[PDB]
A paper describes a structure:
Here, we describe a crystal structure of a tapasin–HLA-B*44:05–β2m complex (determined at 3.1 Å resolution) as well as structures of tapasin complexed with Fab fragments of two well-characterized monoclonal antibodies. Tapasin binds to a broad surface of the external aspect of B44:05 including the α2-1 helix, the α3 domain, and β2m. The tapasin N–IgV domain forms a glove-like surface that addresses the MHC-I platform and cradles the α2-1 helix and supporting β7 and β8 strands and connecting loops. The second B44:05-binding loop of tapasin, Glu72 to Lys84, a structural feature unique to tapasin and absent in TAPBPR, interacts with the α2-1 helix (including side chains Gln141, Arg145, and Glu148) of B44:05. The third major tapasin loop, Gln189 to His195, protrudes beneath the β-sheet floor of the peptide binding groove to contact platform strands β6 and β7, also directing His190 towards Glu212 of the B44:05 α3 domain. In addition to these major interactions involving tapasin’s N–IgV domain, the IgC domain engages the membrane proximal domains of MHC-I through contacts with 16 residues of the α3 domain and 8 of β2m. This extensive interaction with β2m is of particular interest as it may weaken the β2m-dependent scaffolding of the peptide binding domain floor and prevent the well-documented cooperativity between peptide and β2m binding. The tapasin-stabilized peptide-receptive state of HLA-B*44:05 is characterized by distortion of the peptide binding groove and destabilization of the β2-microglobulin interaction, leading to release of peptide.
Loading of MHC-I molecules with peptide by the catalytic chaperone tapasin in the peptide loading complex plays a critical role in antigen presentation and immune recognition. Mechanistic insight has been hampered by the lack of detailed structural information concerning tapasin–MHC-I. We present here crystal structures of human tapasin complexed with the MHC-I molecule HLA-B*44:05, and with each of two anti-tapasin antibodies. Movements of the membrane proximal Ig-like domains of tapasin, HLA-B*44:05, and β2-microglobulin accompany the transition to a peptide-receptive state. Together this ensemble of crystal structures provides insights into a distinct mechanism of tapasin-mediated peptide exchange.
Author numbering:
A (entry chain D): 1 to 11, 20 to 27, 34 to 331, 338 to 381
B (entry chain B): 3 to 54, 63 to 98
C (entry chain A): 1 to 274
The structure:
């Protein structure tokens, strides 16, 4: 990925993250050098398109708010905040057409640094997805990527009678544009009552290993069965820990190409010195109705394929299956068996839009 | 939401006789929208709206060289939109 | 029957023509019982339906002051949106909101809708369990973090557990000539000319109130979606939600295609050919 990640701060204030050049004006408490025990953020921005344009970054603060879900009772069997989770909390959210990131950090009070004036932080929760916009085919199951990483509190170890990586939760809220619901919500590793399964989707969510004291990285790949374009749109994926939670956004769209129709397609003669009948031009799906361009052209004489056609035309504009009409003028001694063409430019279509033709005599 | 604006007639238009010119605007918010009509570029009077988005209409006598149009100004439109006269 | 009560807000910026306009309406069944407009000589909650006109004036004046309070607050919301949305004050972007209660056949609440929308694109929404939110993207994520540190979910939960139920039952008492509030659509078919050789047919369903309605087309018994335009549910502007699905088909095969509406306002996925 890029060397530096510039960013904004509200809840604007400019800042930057470093995965150094002098930066005197930026607040020494807003320019962060990121420490990574798990290498998740580091080796994940390493396997990142370096040199890509500026993604969408945003920084803010946070306080460990437990999950409001009553089933989450079990990960938090006591309403006391841990001692090693004091100080400041920072949450950074980044979005890009390659990977989406949500990270938690705990910096230091003094930004004083003897080499160069910069600040050190440390990542306690990493969330990174490499599928920010899948496009699955109609009638086949859908797989989604979502990795995370939780570093244990480097200090608290002389009191925990149950060492090792603690459990965690994964929650995917999904679909039904114009409304909202929940599809997945499961905390594997806890003898607690889990909710039902809507549509029957599940996720592979666990740890990659089981090293007791070092950092931890975990997989959380979602899996939906046979999908249908009534589930298209947006969804949110969140990873949960005691008092902690981190969410990212994902989008999904489907593809269906259009087809053409151009009547009258084939006709019989039309005596010389006579205007041919009312010709038409129609398209199937194109929406909405902003920026639509309509062109009528005579193709069967002199002047190339870009002439302001003679005769009368007809354009128009919860969308449109437009019906352009055309009344061509009488013919000359140069348009025997000529043709007429109609061109529709719409943002959804290619830059050529859609062309249709009608043969004359 | 940008409005759908179809400028049609009530009967197949002829030259020399009178007919209706109907600018059907729909699908947007708010209810108030600056929907006017032009004749040769000049803001005409007489433009109807529906009762309590829907159809606007008037009557005219279509001819050869004269030209009508429907001007629409909605808050999404940074500048107004001129839908051209259409007979066929 | 399964009922629903809806209040609709709509804010929009309009530089050069004044200040951000605000509009509000109220719907029970397909009946508009109260309107509102900031561009009015007296932006009062005005009487519309001949059954709401018997309510206490405290309700009317309180809801009018609430309308003006929401006008101010959502002007501030338009401001805070325009601030960190990378947009200009020379243009104008509209925000809309719909919130209300849906109850079952016994008046017992099913849930409560409370969803926004920005520039046609959806914004944020509240789930059925009233304990979680559904956002759209990074800025809607900021608003979801704001209102997730501010439980509007439980607010509306305990609100519909007391206010919306009483109001909906009182409005049912105001008019027992209809037990249909979860509005099914009102449908027809539009013909578009391809002259003698072909035709465009559009199955329109409007008038209804929700948004999730599965509109399909079936040829004989075969589902054919490749040639169909199923555009998103776009409301009308008078708060009667609309939708349609069309096809340019040759002048003949149109009979094989049949419209199909899946909805809960309609008692069943009805078949349509009008």
């Amino acid at each position: 990925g890029p060397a530096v990640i510039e960013c904004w701060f509200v809840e604007k204030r400019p800042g930057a993250l470093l995965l150094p050049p002098p930066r005197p004006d930026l607040d020494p408490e807003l320019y962060l050098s990121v420490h990574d025990p798990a290498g998740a953020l580091q080796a994940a921005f390493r396997r990142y398109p370096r040199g890509a344009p500026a993604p969408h970054c945003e920084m803010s603060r946070f306080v460990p708010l437990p999950a409001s879900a009553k089933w989450a009772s079990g990960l938090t069997p006591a309403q006391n905040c841990p001692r090693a989770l004091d100080g400041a909390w920072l949450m950074v959210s980044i979005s890009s057409p390659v990977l989406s990131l949500s990270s938690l950090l705990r910096p230091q009070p003094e930004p004083q640094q003897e080499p160069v004036l910069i600040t050190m932080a440390t990542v306690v929760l990493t969330v990174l997805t490499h599928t920010p916009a899948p496009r699955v085919r109609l009638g086949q199951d859908a797989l989604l990527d979502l990795s995370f990483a939780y570093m244990p509190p480097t200090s608290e170890a002389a009191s925990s009678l149950a060492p090792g990586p603690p459990p965690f939760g994964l929650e995917w809220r999904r679909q039904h544009l114009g409304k909202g619901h929940l599809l997945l919500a499961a905390t594997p590793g806890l003898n607690g009552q889990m909710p039902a399964a809507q549509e029957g989707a599940v996720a592979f969510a666990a740890w990659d290993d089981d090293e007791p004291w070092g950092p931890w990285t975990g997989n959380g790949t979602f899996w939906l069965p046979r999908v249908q374009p009534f589930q298209e749109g947006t969804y949110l994926a969140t990873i949960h820990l005691p008092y902690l939670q981190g969410q990212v956004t994902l989008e999904l769209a489907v593809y269906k190409p259009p087809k053409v129709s151009l009547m009258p397609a084939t006709l019989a003669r039309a005596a010389p010195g006579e205007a041919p009948p009312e010709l038409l031009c129609l398209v199937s799906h194109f929406y909405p109705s902003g920026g639509l361009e309509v062109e009528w052209e005579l193709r069967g004489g002199p002047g190339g394929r870009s002439q302001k056609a003679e005769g009368q035309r007809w354009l128009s504009a919860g969308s449109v299956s437009l019906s352009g009409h055309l009344q061509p003028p009488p013919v000359t001694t140069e348009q025997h068996g000529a043709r007429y063409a109609c061109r529709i430019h719409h943002p959804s279509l290619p830059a050529s839009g859609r062309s249709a033709e009608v043969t004359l005599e | 939401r940008t409005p759908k604006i179809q400028v049609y007639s009530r009967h197949p238009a002829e030259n020399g006789k009178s007919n209706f010119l109907n600018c059907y605007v729909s699908g947007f918010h708010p209810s108030d929208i600056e929907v006017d009509l032009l004749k040769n570029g000049e803001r005409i009077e007489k433009v109807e709206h529906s009762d309590l988005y829907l159809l606007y209409y008037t009557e005219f006598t279509p001819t050869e060289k004269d030209e009508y149009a429907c001007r629409v100004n909605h808050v999404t439109l940074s500048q107004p939109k001129i839908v051209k006269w259409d007979r066929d | 029957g399964s009922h629903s009560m809806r209040y609709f807000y709509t804010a929009m910026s309009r530089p050069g023509r004044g200040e951000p306009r605000f509009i509000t309406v109220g719907y029970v069944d397909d009946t508009l019982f109260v309107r509102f407009d900031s561009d009015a000589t007296s932006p009062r909650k005005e009487p519309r339906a001949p059954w709401i006109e018997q309510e206490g004036p405290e309700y009317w004046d309180r809801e009018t002051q609430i309308s003006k309070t929401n006008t101010q607050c959502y002007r501030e919301n338009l401001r805070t949106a325009l601030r960190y949305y990378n947009q200009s004050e020379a243009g104008s972007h509209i925000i809309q909101r719909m919130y209300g209660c849906d109850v079952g056949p016994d008046g017992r609440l099913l849930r409560g809708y409370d969803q926004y929308a920005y520039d046609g694109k959806d914004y944020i929404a509240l789930n059925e369990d009233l304990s979680s939110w559904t956002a759209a993207d990074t800025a809607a994520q900021i608003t979801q973090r704001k209102w997730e540190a501010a439980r509007v979910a439980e607010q509306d939960r305990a609100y519909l557990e007391g206010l919306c139920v009483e109001s909906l039952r009182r409005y049912l008492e105001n008019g027992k000539e209809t037990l249909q509030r979860a509005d099914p659509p009102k449908t027809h078919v539009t013909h578009h000319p391809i002259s003698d050789h072909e035709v465009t047919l559009r199955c329109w369903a409007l008038g209804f109130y929700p948004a999730e309605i599965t509109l399909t087309w079936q040829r004989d018994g075969e589902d054919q979606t490749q040639d169909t335009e199923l555009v998103e549910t776009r409301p009308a502007g008078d708060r009667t939600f609309q939708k349609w699905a069309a096809v340019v088909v040759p002048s003949g095969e149109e009979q094989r295609y049949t419209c199909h509406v899946q909805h809960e306002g309609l008692p069943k996925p009805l078949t349509l050919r009008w």
